[PDB]
Design a protein around this ligand. Structure first.
Ligand code: NA
Lengths: 595, 404, 595, 404
């Protein structure tokens, strides 16, 4: 008997060169699925085979100008090339001229998506419902409400120093019952409206955290092309010379009618060439792209070097492979028995598990975890760590009691003139709110910057985007506007009015310390500046967030906004006045009650 | 054969010039609805056509100085055209000189407004989950337990629950976590408890409704008809300044559109638009305070454009139709007339509208926005307005304390 | 000139008889849209008309066996019957043989659904998240935890009588801070685990109420047939001889492909005949049915006697009406001008508003309302009303102090022997849980009853469904089972063990009142029976709700379950023992401390 | 012409007898997939067919005593049939005597389990929103603040915060609303506060997650492959007792299905089903503890039946195919073979499967269930188990109190 000439193709893992090639000869240079399958069929049939490799590169098709065939179907029709144990898809136009055996493998068009890519929660992730503008104004709040209870209970009739009134503050905001209670009509109103502050913020934090966790459950990963059909944020993709595209056009099923419709009319080109590109467009387009393989390919890609892509769903259609006997040869019935005999003993299921899975280098809670609430354990430990430090402080302060007024004047004076400074500096030095925007250039994740600002209150000015050194002023301007100075002008200007009263009557109490009521009314007008700082900065940011929601989203266009060093200086100026507003009023108590 | 001269005019999506309009032939450079329609009419009737975009540039109207038709009607009557497969609107003065054909598309005057996007919060927008009748029935019951806890604790010991205290312990209860002036009576056992159960169910109804308020974002349009747009005065009207739309409101006598005309009669921020595409941007810029009135073919197309910014609301105010015209006496007049119906019966005219308006278009067919300081804004105002009101009454207190 | 013969049809509101007919003559017997339109056209054209009414009944069609026409199109072809001002739809098969004018009215296939039918919230609607099994076991809880604090603080070392411990109970469950606190290691554990009870129930009530209000917003009313296409709980309906059905078959639009698919293969028959039936199938099939009219009909039905149906969506297709001139008559061009002249002046828009709307007898908050939370105002008022009643009680009890032990023995003894009774009665008398089930017969809202039970614990027995008088027993049974006695047997049996100790040592304290510690340990074993009653009834219902969730829904099949008089007797037996468990222990305190 | 005798067998949805099976003709009384398939094969090839439901009633197999084919293969070979448009499965022993045709439907052995319906709660099911690592890190930090509040308040006054109290005030804090043994030190200002902020964020994470736990009901299947069904022992295997499915697991040598065969070898509650429709009810009755193994055509059909109670999970274990058979040498063998492919290329075979399995079927393609006492069940058990533990230690307390 002669040597039957097998004609496979260099496609992995079907036929690929052995690593020790250019050192071997003939049919013991190849390895793969079809090399093991050729060895199986030959034992059953009676062969003594000898593999070659397909001439041009191709599987088989009919050139519509000359009606010649090309490739494996080309070689076996035209006199050359016997039995064709190879990934040759059973179509109608091939089996008119050649004989296919029964399918040794059942493929189909399937969906490739990148691996669901877990998105590990941050340390301070619990403070995601309330934004960081809200968390910093709460710190301004329970400091400030403590100072008012420092005032209004030792103002006149008693147990509400800043030591005790921050305890009211840290007490009531964290919803636990405060031990003591005020006893004056004005003392209750502070405890009255602060207990309304906590009941809204906690009911806004819980309700928005239930808005995060519900929508996160409400989304769903792709598990079918029916699921892909509704979706428009994950774009499809097909090879554009071949049977994957050919399926969607002439299909009449209503889902594939909608799927081709999107692919036909979209931008940019989703009709990829050269499948290695299509695999790449899945990987560097995270959760935005979905390429459509043939099922025996994307099960191979999945069990291969880094396991980045994954098959989801079921076979959209059904097809097969087949050994391709020439047209009427005597190797057409014994091969057709030697496929069905291997597909029952389990050899065709063993050789798939071998090359796809076993020679593949890869692998095979509806509840909050510790990583979600992680910062509150670190605030707890970071809190208790601060507590043991202050346990040293009271032990040393009592030890000095075992074994000054001028310092109290020293604290109040210096904290005042820095509070006079850092507000007046900040309103003068134009380094408040930093607006930033631009549009996107795709495929590069661009850096469009063109526009910016560095605007304060009065001297609003611009830096890039024609670069405009002579920018604008409060004198009438001519499209963006700036509602910062438009509404929140008097709220720092009345703050300066209370604060100018503050340092002068402090100095009146300084130059002649026997004056008592002067330092008293000095302190009263310190906190009324600091309360104007609160309604200043709140109405400040609220005017910005109203300008934020006026965006009319514009998905491509991006934005950015950051606070400047002057916004920090007025935030620091809140601390300097208020913590002097306690020391000025406490200085009255040490002075006048001694008198 | 005869090479029928088909006239059209350049408006989207009826005839749009393809990007190869400098490197292709006449019948292959134009795309659109009328391009797909002229292929279907020629397929059923049977002729050869070459698209002949109008020389003047208008649809058609009489000039009552020289009595000469202009535009596409002008090419039909005088001789330079043979069919007019285009968006000619069937009117009386056009009907006297040419022959239309049994409308292939039914349009009407409609309402164009800006998209209902997410809006600005108020300074009392945290009172949105619980309605206004519940907030007042709490306060009227806050005074209710206040007068009970006084009349209980004054009549029973025969007095740590006067006007001063009984108003307070109810406030200390509903604004949560309690207060240390606990009642002491078996009535006060109840007076404590049954107000305290009223604390639980309101706050659990405030939290749960606000969670549903933030999960399913379900926005609505301000106006949804000409009726609701008639009674309002906030959102401004708008119409073209010389056309069939402005003429429609003038002579109408059903007294609803006459009300809409009496607004636009005075109307002095100049609501009338010149050159419609200006009025498209006028809706986009004027913050949903402006409502332009278009034909319902342009409203369904501009809605399907980038930037997605406008939406049609309501039913068609009137009904007018398009029509494949033919000259006053021709051989095409009857076979086209049965061809326009036969496309409509099979669903071709319903598919070609679906393709160009809805399929070949933008805007397609949950982002978990965190809360802003503008959402909870007035709570800071009530807080500082509480703290400021404390220092006033303390200054009142210090007055009569030192005086007495 | 002659008298042109108009041929309309008795269809409302187009042509219908005037109320004063059989008293008038000719063309002044009719009224409607087409009677006003005939008067309009005649003025423009030049007529002197005379209405008749269509011969057989019909509009016009071609009988496919004999090719004769029938009706209005029948009469105007065959020599009779001039101008045809009537609801004659412009189709292709009519205009081949007759001339239609331009459409005077633009109809379309539209959706009819019943009015959204507001579903007014109940008085006690706030207690819908937690079911009434949970609310009654809470009442068992804060009664019981009060009795344990009645015990464990006057057990040994002080301020926790039932007067004060219900105050702990009513205090802590309603989340407000309790004034006093226990001081003993066992006293804190009661306050410890009860403060864990409230934190789960409140967090289960708030979280489930947010499950109701979100899904209620998440549903959406029908506003398009695209919205109808996804839905499967509202079934469609079409007339079955006519153009409404004819549209869905030969349509190729993907939505109408899916809409016909459902209608073609469903059960029962949704292809209604005789439109008045189809309107009726909308009305007595509340939010389950949707019939598909032609747009000029369901805008008439909507503005008509009781306004029960409503048009939603837009026109699925587009069509028209038309005056139908014969084939080549001289009344074909002046009518074609007299329609377009009326459709510009607004007369065809005036006559629609007249007959549809003006001669129609009909009309033209994303927030909780008071009706939702209504019972808590009634609990508040009903609470304060009870308070003023007890204000009389303390005033009279102090007035008797101004101006008995045997009663305390009398309270404890009688409440014990009724507690011995009503538990022993209930476990004996088989009238516990009432199961009920059956399947549904549609179109009648059936009363299937066949099966039931009246089962207690031991004597489980059956009443209907072969009626089975000899039912079953605890001796082995042979499909439903009964896990009541399977798990919750010892929890009342250990309760009898504590309770048998209870009344005997009570009677030992009765026959010789100088015995002190006997009545003490009498009381200890009263509440341990009542605590076994708690874990009895909880594990009871929890075993039922596990059997409830084993249902595997079966949408047609219904179910019902009610508690019996024996379940109430053991619930009453909880009160009788516990409220004697306070009076027995308080009797020790009055006795031994006096000694 | 020739009146081709087409054989089939009565199984759904291949050939089902229509309700007019006593008042119609042969070719109009049967409906199904093979009925629609035999119309398509006759349309492309060209002949006349009359359906000839098999006399014996089986598919086909050798009887190795008399060597006579039975069933549909028996009618083909011996002469009583001409084509076999039916669900014959292509096997080797059938291939030697007749000629199949290039499968029109690709099936495989699959896994049949009960639907994952809503399940029973546990007696500790209220610990489901917060995971098990969070509940333990609370208790380990509950002891953490306990040892801090002692070491602060013992070292500072140089003692109302011993073992007795410092364990208590942390419990009084996290189990909400506070306790009246308030700390007194600037450390105790912190020790109060930073534990109190830990109260807020956990309970707001418990409430918000439980609200998401009840809103979106998202159930999962226990097993979702043969791999996950291999490693378990809880859910029982199941296969037919004499067929190609049982024979498949026996001779398989890939060692995963060999593990599945070693279970069914011992298997003594008799897992093997006689007459498959019994095993359909065995999955329905045995509470999702039984998993039957079917061909993937029956699993996709019985899933689309009333009562909707079973679902297929996982991929096909093997791959076998159907086939329109033809006798050993015929004139129909080649034109049918190209007709089966030509239907598949056009999408006819994909549509006819879609029609009979998925369209002409039940089970279609949020009910707001209130909580039950079984949901919050163990909280009553911790409560009474707390109250019972109180009376024990009190009895311990009374012992050494009167003794000392
Ligand atoms: Na809460």
């Amino acid at each position: 008997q002669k040597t039957v000439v097998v004609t496979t193709i260099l496609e992995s893992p079907y036929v690929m060169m052995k690593k020790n090639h250019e050192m071997l000869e003939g049919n013991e240079r190849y390895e793969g699925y079809c090399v093991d399958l050729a060895a199986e069929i030959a034992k059953h049939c009676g062969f003594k085979y000898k593999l070659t490799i397909v001439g041009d590169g191709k599987y088989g098709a009919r050139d519509a100008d000359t009606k010649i065939w090309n490739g494996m179907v080309g070689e076996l029709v035209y006199g050359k090339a016997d039995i064709a144990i190879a990934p040759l898809t059973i179509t109608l136009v091939r089996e008119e001229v050649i004989d296919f055996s029964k399918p040794f493998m059942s493929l189909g068009i399937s969906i490739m998506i990148k691996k669901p890519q877990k998105s590990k929660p941050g340390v301070f992730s619990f403070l995601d419902p309330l934004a960081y503008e809200i968390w910093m104004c709460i710190v301004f709040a329970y400091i400030g409400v403590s100072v008012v209870l420092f005032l209004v209970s030792r103002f006149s009739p008693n147990e509400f120093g800043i030591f005790n009134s921050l305890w009211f503050s840290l007490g009531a905001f964290m919803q636990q019952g405060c031990d003591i209670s005020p006893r004056s009509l004005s003392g209750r109103i502070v405890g009255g409206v602060w207990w309304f502050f906590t009941l809204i913020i906690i009911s806004s934090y819980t309700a928005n955290l239930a808005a995060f966790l519900t929508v996160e459950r409400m989304v769903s990963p792709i598990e079918s092309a029916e699921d892909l059909s509704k979706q428009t944020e994950i774009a499809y993709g097909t090879l554009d010379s071949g049977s994957t595209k050919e399926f969607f056009r002439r299909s009449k099923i209503a889902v594939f009618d909608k799927m081709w419709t999107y692919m036909r009319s979209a931008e940019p080109s989703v009709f990829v060439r050269t499948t290695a590109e299509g695999v790449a467009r899945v990987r560097k387009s995270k959760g935005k792209y979905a390429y459509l393989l043939e099922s025996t390919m994307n099960e191979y890609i999945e069990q291969r070097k880094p396991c980045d892509t994954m098959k989801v769903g079921g076979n959209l259609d059904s097809k097969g492979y087949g050994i391709a006997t020439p047209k009427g040869s005597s190797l057409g019935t014994p091969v057709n028995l030697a496929v069905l005999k291997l597909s029952e003993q389990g050899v065709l299921d063993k050789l798939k598990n071998k090359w796809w899975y076993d020679k593949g280098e890869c692998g095979a809670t509806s509840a909050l975890s510790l990583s979600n609430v992680a910062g509150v354990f670190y605030i707890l430990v970071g809190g208790l760590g601060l507590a043991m430090l202050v346990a040293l402080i009271e032990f040393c302060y009592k030890s000095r009691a075992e074994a000054g007024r001028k310092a109290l004047t020293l604290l109040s004076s210096v904290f005042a003139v820095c509070g006079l400074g850092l507000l007046g500096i900040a309103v003068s030095t134009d380094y408040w709110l930093y607006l930033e925007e631009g549009i996107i250039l795709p495929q590069n994740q661009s850096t469009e910057v063109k526009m910016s600002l560095h605007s304060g209150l009065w001297r609003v000015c611009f830096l890039a985007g024609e670069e405009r050194g002579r920018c604008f002023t409060i004198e009438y301007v001519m499209v963006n506007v700036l509602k910062m100075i438009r509404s929140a002008t008097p709220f720092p200007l009345v703050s300066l009015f209370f604060m100018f009263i503050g340092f002068i009557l402090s100095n009146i109490g300084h130059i002649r310390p026997h004056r008592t009521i002067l330092a008293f009314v000095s302190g009263i007008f310190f906190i009324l500046s600091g309360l104007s700082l609160v309604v200043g900065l709140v109405l400040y940011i609220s005017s910005i967030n109203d300008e934020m929601l006026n965006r009319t989203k514009d998905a491509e266009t991006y934005f950015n906004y950051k606070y400047g060093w002057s916004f920090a200086f007025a935030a620091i100026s809140f601390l300097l006045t208020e913590s002097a507003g306690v020391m000025s009023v406490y200085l009255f108590m040490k002075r006048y009650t001694a008198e």
